[PDB]
Amino acid sequence: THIQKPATGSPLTLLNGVLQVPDQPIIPFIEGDGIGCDVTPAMRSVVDAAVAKVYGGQRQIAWMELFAGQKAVQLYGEGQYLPDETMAAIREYKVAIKGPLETPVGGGIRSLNVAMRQDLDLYVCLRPVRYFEGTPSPMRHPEKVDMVIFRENSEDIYAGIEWPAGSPEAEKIIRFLREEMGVTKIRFPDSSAIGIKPVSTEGSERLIRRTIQYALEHGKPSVSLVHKGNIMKFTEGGFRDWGYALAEREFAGRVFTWRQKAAISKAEGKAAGQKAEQQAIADGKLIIKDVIADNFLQQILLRPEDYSVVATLNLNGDYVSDALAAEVGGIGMAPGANLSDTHAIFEATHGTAPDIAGQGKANPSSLILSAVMMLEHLGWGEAAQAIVAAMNATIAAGEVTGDLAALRGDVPALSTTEFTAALIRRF
Amino acid sequence: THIQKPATGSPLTLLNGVLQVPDQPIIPFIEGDGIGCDVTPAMRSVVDAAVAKVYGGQRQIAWMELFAGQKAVQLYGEGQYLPDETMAAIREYKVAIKGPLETPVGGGIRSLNVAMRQDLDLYVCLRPVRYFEGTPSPMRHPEKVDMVIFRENSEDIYAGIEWPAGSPEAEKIIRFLREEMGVTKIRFPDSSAIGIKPVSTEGSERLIRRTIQYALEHGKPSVSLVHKGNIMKFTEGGFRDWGYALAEREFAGRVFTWRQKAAISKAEGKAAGQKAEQQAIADGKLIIKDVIADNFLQQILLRPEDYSVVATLNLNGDYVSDALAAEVGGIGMAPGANLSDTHAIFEATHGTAPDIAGQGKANPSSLILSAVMMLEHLGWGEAAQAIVAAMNATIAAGEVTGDLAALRGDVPALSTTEFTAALIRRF
Ligand SMILES: NC(=O)c1ccc[n+]([C@@H]2O[C@H](COP(=O)([O-])OP(=O)(O)OC[C@H]3O[C@@H](n4cnc5c(N)ncnc54)[C@H](O)[C@@H]3O)[C@@H](O)[C@H]2O)c1
Ligand SMILES: NC(=O)c1ccc[n+]([C@@H]2O[C@H](COP(=O)([O-])OP(=O)(O)OC[C@H]3O[C@@H](n4cnc5c(N)ncnc54)[C@H](O)[C@@H]3O)[C@@H](O)[C@H]2O)c1
């Protein structure tokens, strides 16, 4: 072992439904590769300051370092990118927050980020994207972005099921596809690498159910199912169809969907369909609609105001998260949470930022905002709100890191530590 | 048969492997579903007006209507969405232009758009995206967008290989994957639909070769290989790696890749790597770089000015095209061409737009600009340049269709017909 349980902490526990949160909870954290070394300490400093301010010391996070990535390899030895004790500790402690981890391209280890999500079955990747007043942005009207993305986190092509071109394995699956499955559409079978995309009714349903539940509980006007269901009919189109079906049987009478709208239109005409939709909106009924993924990218740029909650697949969610984050300053302003029904790993949308690593420039806001989601998860709402208020005031005053300052000629950059200080001095 | 060879036209021919264009070329066209009924007649009018003007009546397109989609079904019979005679005609006449075609979601027919591309092996989907001065845009600085997308058009998950959840076929492939391929990562094997993603060395290579050739002959500063090769290591990561290898092998002394840069950064440090790139740019070398797909979506929004030519896979290309189009007004300002080494089908980036079909509102600019590409393909550059000049002037004058008028206040909306007339008055 290379991990040490805090001396004054007490673990979170689960008791007949409820998550029990001690006043000095043990919260595991992973530093992260690259800019993890800048953003994690900043996040802890900010969280600690907020908590001390709002509760007077009655409460205090008992941080416990766990290891993964390069820091793990250096401490545990070669190939020890994800030590067993790391995963065991997260299971036991039920919550954790992590900086980014490096995943190599074209070869090397499988994503540790994805591996953690799979191992703990954290099937919801939850990413709220909203505009902080005054944030430098490439958009004319970034304030019109206020969305919540529910990204399926356990399946899709992220499963990591693939074989390299020319390998015995690729030849073996290509032969099965052509000889046993009757596949005729592989263009270049002699040099094809092959990837598998599993998308299930069970996986789609649990993600979409949580999405609708959230939308209803928070008074959100709509849920958009985004998919490329015309080309990927049974996977992505399945996601959409299973989604509408679930909405209409588990939430009958509490939602109005575009599937229902189509039924009304087919039988009574467009006007009737439109009228029924207008009546639902008038009723405070949650609207469930759907958008093809490419057009979705167009719509969130042209009219983001028309969207609220989004339910989508793993790959689509990844791409949408980045496009949307860019509208509000980039992935330095983009928090996230990986949730199952019992556990949670809080984690920024961004990666290791190799181009600024070691320079003390990175925006810690995404991770800080992820810690906000964590505090909300812990029921420490007042601390959470204190951080959001401080963040709102800091950005509005024009105190920002370099990723934001680069977007406007009239805004200078602050280092990671300078920004952290600017935020904390406002508590 | 339900088609007719025009009375006064002559087919395109060849001479030493080079396209020979008669003064009255036979050019097949397909109207398209939905707004195809608006945009196709508009494109023909504009093209005819430009040709009549610049060549003083010495030249004239002999349009030949071919059928696909709904129009084909009503004419040829139920199920006849893509008559064999349509594809044979395009093979015969070598160049065609088509309106959008409807592809159902979650079932129904396989995409006719993809089917045409596959049938004629039009492996390059070429989509130039640039800003027309004065176009309403959601961006603060849309003028910074000037890119050319090369989207692989023959493989990837677009092959249409998949089987539905619960089906005997899905059960069959899942069993083979788990029992014979050793696959353990399928989360819900009992209810998964399965899609297959083939990406090959041969397919990736010919698309990337065409991209680099284009970049070099048009004097572009860089080619960006966009991929999600950290998660899809052997397909998308293969695309990247094969791309760098081909560049260095086939265009040595004309390019400088980040693969080369990485090597210099390893042996001599990053300062040496940056210097080498600086000198390559000074030397007039084409830079070959790469960007992970999600980050690329962020970057084309934050700093599009850093990108020029893009080479990417089928699915990524589809998503990137819509996001980039939105920056310059939407997919109503986004032309395209499907190209093999011998044949070409020109086609807008947009779909059938059911929300405005039948209303005479559609922006015909995408299809018109696709015909501009067609005219350049035919070596009728003067007519191509005339349409561009009329387009530049008409947009700058504030004379636009509803899709653009919606992006900015105090800008009236012209109908398709009205916009068409406005363009034509510049001739
Ligand atoms: N959850 C995760 O741990 C996670 C997420 C995304 C990427 N990654 C990994 O990160 C590595 C690098 O990938 P990449 O370069 O495509 O993406 P990246 O997110 O690391 O960097 C992309 C761009 O965004 C900028 N950026 C990201 N975070 C920033 C911050 N907080 N402050 C200021 N600028 C920031 C970077 O400077 C860079 O220019 C890859 O190995 C990838 O697998 C990990
Ligand atoms: N190459 C093609 O033939 C092609 C391309 C994309 C989509 N499609 C098909 O089109 C159908 C509709 O798909 P969708 O609704 O997701 O996308 P779409 O491109 O048809 O429409 C998306 C949005 O963009 C707007 N839009 C598109 N073209 C426009 C134009 N020229 N002028 C003004 N507004 C325009 C529409 O009004 C709509 O709001 C689907 O069946 C899809 O398969 C075909």
Short mmCIF file of C-alpha atoms and ligand atoms in Angstrom, two decimals, chain A residues 35 39 98-105 111 113 117 127 318 322 331-333 347-356 361-366 401-404, chain B residues 228 230-231 291-296 298-299 303, ligand 1:
data_model
loop_
_atom_site.label_atom_id
_atom_site.label_comp_id
_atom_site.label_asym_id
_atom_site.label_seq_id
_atom_site.Cartn_x
_atom_site.Cartn_y
_atom_site.Cartn_z
CA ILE A 35 -2.24 20.09 -15.83
CA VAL A 39 -5.78 22.26 -11.31
CA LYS A 98 -9.92 13.40 -10.29
CA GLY A 99 -7.77 15.50 -12.57
CA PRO A 100 -7.31 14.41 -16.21
CA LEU A 101 -5.49 11.25 -17.28
CA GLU A 102 -3.48 10.68 -20.45
CA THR A 103 -4.76 8.20 -23.05
CA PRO A 104 -2.31 7.47 -25.92
CA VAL A 105 -3.38 7.55 -29.59
CA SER A 111 -8.22 4.93 -21.41
CA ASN A 113 -10.87 7.41 -17.56
CA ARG A 117 -16.34 4.51 -15.60
CA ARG A 127 -22.11 17.77 -17.77
CA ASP A 318 -18.15 13.57 -25.97
CA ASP A 322 -16.73 20.17 -26.37
CA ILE A 331 -13.34 23.16 -21.77
CA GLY A 332 -11.63 25.16 -19.03
CA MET A 333 -15.19 26.16 -18.01
CA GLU A 347 -13.99 15.14 -13.18
CA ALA A 348 -13.55 18.02 -15.64
CA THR A 349 -14.39 17.63 -19.30
CA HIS A 350 -10.84 18.58 -20.29
CA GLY A 351 -7.68 16.56 -20.76
CA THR A 352 -4.05 16.82 -19.70
CA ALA A 353 -3.37 19.92 -21.86
CA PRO A 354 0.17 18.91 -22.90
CA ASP A 355 0.69 22.30 -24.59
CA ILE A 356 0.46 24.22 -21.27
CA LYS A 361 -1.42 28.49 -16.77
CA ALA A 362 -4.35 26.07 -16.78
CA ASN A 363 -7.90 27.14 -15.95
CA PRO A 364 -8.91 25.32 -12.73
CA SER A 365 -12.54 26.41 -13.15
CA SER A 366 -13.77 23.15 -14.75
CA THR A 401 -6.80 32.56 -16.98
CA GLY A 402 -5.03 32.51 -20.32
CA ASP A 403 -7.47 30.22 -22.22
CA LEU A 404 -10.17 32.82 -21.68
CA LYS B 228 -10.68 9.96 -32.07
CA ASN B 230 -7.09 7.53 -28.36
CA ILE B 231 -10.37 5.59 -27.88
CA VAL B 291 -6.26 16.90 -33.57
CA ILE B 292 -8.43 14.68 -31.39
CA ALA B 293 -12.03 14.98 -32.65
CA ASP B 294 -13.65 16.46 -29.55
CA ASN B 295 -10.93 19.05 -29.03
CA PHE B 296 -11.13 19.83 -32.75
CA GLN B 298 -13.65 23.19 -29.55
CA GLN B 299 -10.77 24.58 -31.61
CA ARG B 303 -9.57 29.63 -33.23
N1 LIG C 1 -11.23 12.95 -18.54
C1 LIG C 1 -9.95 13.01 -18.93
O1 LIG C 1 -8.93 12.62 -18.08
C2 LIG C 1 -9.60 13.46 -20.31
C3 LIG C 1 -10.48 14.24 -21.07
C4 LIG C 1 -10.08 14.69 -22.33
C5 LIG C 1 -8.82 14.35 -22.82
N2 LIG C 1 -7.97 13.56 -22.07
C6 LIG C 1 -6.62 13.19 -22.54
O2 LIG C 1 -5.84 14.37 -22.62
C7 LIG C 1 -4.78 14.15 -23.54
C8 LIG C 1 -4.65 15.38 -24.42
O3 LIG C 1 -5.77 15.44 -25.30
P1 LIG C 1 -6.07 16.78 -26.11
O4 LIG C 1 -4.82 17.54 -26.28
O5 LIG C 1 -6.90 16.41 -27.29
O6 LIG C 1 -7.10 17.61 -25.20
P2 LIG C 1 -6.84 18.51 -23.90
O7 LIG C 1 -8.24 18.72 -23.31
O8 LIG C 1 -5.82 17.95 -23.00
O9 LIG C 1 -6.31 19.92 -24.48
C9 LIG C 1 -7.07 20.48 -25.55
C10 LIG C 1 -6.83 21.99 -25.67
O10 LIG C 1 -7.63 22.59 -24.66
C11 LIG C 1 -6.82 23.34 -23.78
N3 LIG C 1 -7.22 23.11 -22.39
C12 LIG C 1 -7.77 21.96 -21.86
N4 LIG C 1 -7.98 22.17 -20.53
C13 LIG C 1 -7.59 23.43 -20.23
C14 LIG C 1 -7.58 24.12 -19.03
N5 LIG C 1 -8.14 23.61 -17.93
N6 LIG C 1 -7.10 25.40 -19.02
C15 LIG C 1 -6.64 25.98 -20.18
N7 LIG C 1 -6.63 25.29 -21.38
C16 LIG C 1 -7.10 24.02 -21.38
C17 LIG C 1 -5.41 22.79 -23.96
O11 LIG C 1 -4.43 23.78 -23.66
C18 LIG C 1 -5.37 22.33 -25.41
O12 LIG C 1 -4.99 23.41 -26.25
C19 LIG C 1 -5.12 12.89 -24.33
O13 LIG C 1 -4.25 11.86 -23.89
C20 LIG C 1 -6.55 12.58 -23.94
O14 LIG C 1 -6.86 11.21 -23.93
C21 LIG C 1 -8.36 13.13 -20.83
#
